[PDB]
Amino acid sequence: VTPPPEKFNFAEHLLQTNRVRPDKTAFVDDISSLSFAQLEAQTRQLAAALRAIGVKREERVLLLMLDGTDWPVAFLGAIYAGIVPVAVNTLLTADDYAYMLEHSRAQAVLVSGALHPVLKAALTKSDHEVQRVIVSRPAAPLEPGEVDFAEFVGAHAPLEKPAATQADDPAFWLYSSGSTGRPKGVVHTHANPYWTSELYGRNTLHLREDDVCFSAAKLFFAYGLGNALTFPMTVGATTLLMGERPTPDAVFKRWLGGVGGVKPTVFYGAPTGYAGMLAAPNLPSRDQVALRLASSAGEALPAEIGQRFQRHFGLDIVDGIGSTEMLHIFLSNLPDRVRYGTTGWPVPGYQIELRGDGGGPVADGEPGDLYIHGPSSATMYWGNRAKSRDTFQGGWTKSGDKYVRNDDGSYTYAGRTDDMLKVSGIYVSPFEIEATLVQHPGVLEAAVVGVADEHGLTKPKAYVVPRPGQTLSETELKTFIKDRLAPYKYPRSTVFVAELPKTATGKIQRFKLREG
Numbered sequence: 001v002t003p004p005p006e007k008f009n010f011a012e013h014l015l016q017t018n019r020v021r022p023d024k025t026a027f028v029d030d031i032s033s034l035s036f037a038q039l040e041a042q043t044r045q046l047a048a049a050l051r052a053i054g055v056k057r058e059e060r061v062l063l064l065m066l067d068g069t070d071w072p073v074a075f076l077g078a079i080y081a082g083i084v085p086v087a088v089n090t091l092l093t094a095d096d097y098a099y100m101l102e103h104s105r106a107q108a109v110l111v112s113g114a115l116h117p118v119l120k121a122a123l124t125k126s127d128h129e130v131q132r133v134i135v136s137r138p139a140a141p142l143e144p145g146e147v148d149f150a151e152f153v154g155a156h157a158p159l160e161k162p163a164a165t166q167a168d169d170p171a172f173w174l175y176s177s178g179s180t181g182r183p184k185g186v187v188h189t190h191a192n193p194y195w196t197s198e199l200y201g202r203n204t205l206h207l208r209e210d211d212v213c214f215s216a217a218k219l220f221f222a223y224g225l226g227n228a229l230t231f232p233m234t235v236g237a238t239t240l241l242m243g244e245r246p247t248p249d250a251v252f253k254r255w256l257g258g259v260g261g262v263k264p265t266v267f268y269g270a271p272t273g274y275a276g277m278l279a280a281p282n283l284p285s286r287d288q289v290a291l292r293l294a295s296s297a298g299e300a301l302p303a304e305i306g307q308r309f310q311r312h313f314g315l316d317i318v319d320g321i322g323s324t325e326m327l328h329i330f331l332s333n334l335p336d337r338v339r340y341g342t343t344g345w346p347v348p349g350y351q352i353e354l355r356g357d358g359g360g361p362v363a364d365g366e367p368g369d370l371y372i373h374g375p376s377s378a379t380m381y382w383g384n385r386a387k388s389r390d391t392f393q394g395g396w397t398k399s400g401d402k403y404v405r406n407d408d409g410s411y412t413y414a415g416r417t418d419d420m421l422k423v424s425g426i427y428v429s430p431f432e433i434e435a436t437l438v439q440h441p442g443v444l445e446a447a448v449v450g451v452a453d454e455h456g457l458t459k460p461k462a463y464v465v466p467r468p469g470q471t472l473s474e475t476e477l478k479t480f481i482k483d484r485l486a487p488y489k490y491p492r493s494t495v496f497v498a499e500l501p502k503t504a505t506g507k508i509q510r511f512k513l514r515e516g
């Protein structure tokens with residue numbers, strides 16, 4: 001793979017690539033579609049629009065949008081202007097967004113109408129610097145000074161040239177959280193999505209022009225940003241986007257060609273989703289679908305799920321691991337070489353190391369902490385030098401995962417070095433869930449651990465000491481957690497216990513709860 005030139009704008013790169021196919025569909029959703037040409041036009045008008053409201057080069061904008069055709073216009077339009085979009089999870093709280101606004105010093109917000117209520121709450125509460133709110137598909141009347149996305153784009157002539165950025169200039173941010181503390185602003189360069197799209201999208205998956213890509217993983221996820229934007233645009237594939245929550249039925253509807261008169265050839269999702277599909281009574285048969293490739297990430301794929309999908313479809317699931325910090329997958333199975341119970345082999349272009357207690361290599365068959373050296377690594381966490389030091393060092397990125405290398409050179413997942421649970425593509429902090437539970441007046445103490453369910457998929461499990469003198473039923477606690485947490489954080493079950501095991505410091509011995 002040839003390195004990008006030092007003068008490089010990733011958006012211009014993707015536009016240029018597709019000038020050969022102006023009339024092919026680039027993106028399609030339930031209500032709209034853009035050809036590559038229409039996408040280019042709208043991308044450049046949005047870039048002009050942002051500039052005309054005074055957003056400058058290197059300044060951030062918040063991109064808080066459901067998957068839809070306006071998403072890649074917002075993302076690429078900012079990048080084409082040399083403005084840095086901060087692409088965020090659409091399921092967070094107003095407080096989360098308030099923090100992001102302050103931390104990013106976002107100068108404008110591009111927001112889906114459905115998300116305007118949360119965003120409004122975030123604006124009201126924070127010391128932000130937002131100059132304009134641009135609403136895609138408004139769902140309530142616009143407030144004074146807000147503008148409709150279609151009008152904002154339609155009101156401005158296309159910018160004539162992209163910003164003259166360098167390959168190693170910041171291009172976009174994603175946010176990633178740890179087990180405590182605020183989300184960290186992961187800063188990616190213009191070169192980074194070129195490398196992931198070439199080393200993984202093209203050279204590993206062998207995506208091609210005639211493909212139709214459909215990712216259950218949304219565009220704000222690093223995994224989904226590659227799957228359903230950078231990868232397909234790099235090869236001229238057509239991409240299907242879906243605003244709604246993925247469920248088996250919504251996925252199957254699309255697999256069967258229920259939207260945009262296209263049937264996906266490449267599907268991407270989490271092991272949890274693949275399990276949920278395989279359990280669905282109306283799972284389609286292989287003759288009804290056009291799938292040629294099925295990708296998975298977001299948690300380790302249990303072997304039985306891959307094996308059952310292959311028995312039903314005659315297609316393997318291709319499991320690989322990436323991270324927000326590395327932008328996309330660096331260790332993967334291949335479309336023609338799958339070893340279930342493993343995450344496969346290093347992706348060419350990326351170097352992997354497993355390190356023991358002192359930094360040194362570990363013998364084969366033994367677990368070590370996983371570190372990655374590749375050209376798509378983020379540069380830093382913005383404004384957090386201490387965490388940057390811990391994660392990015394001398395070209396190596398520390399993943400927080402442990403792995404074992406097998407005799408055939410494959411890698412098998414061995415757990416985490418920090419307590420986070422990966423529940424279907426979203427990291428969930430047990431400590432968050434614990435701090436929520438103890439705010440119920442009937443709960444004295446709470447400990448949350450991950451437990452593998454009947455399909456081998458990790459879900460949170462809560463152990464709760466109730467407060468003597470109150471009543472607290474499992475149902476009231478369910479109602480309370482329904483009211484306080486996103487469903488992606490719910491414990492799969494809660495057990496009431498009389499006490500928890502602790503050190504004399506009062507540290508809860510969570511390892512004993514993963515035992516019995």
Ligand SMILES: O=C(O)c1ccccc1F
Nearest residue numbers: 216246247248269270273
């Ligand atoms: O990945 C997912 O989140 C998903 C959810 C439902 C059905 C298929 C899927 F892949």
Ligand SMILES: O=C(O)c1ccccc1F
Nearest residue numbers: 222223297298321322323
């Ligand atoms: O969940 C993953 O393995 C993953 C894959 C691609 C990019 C970011 C990720 F976190």
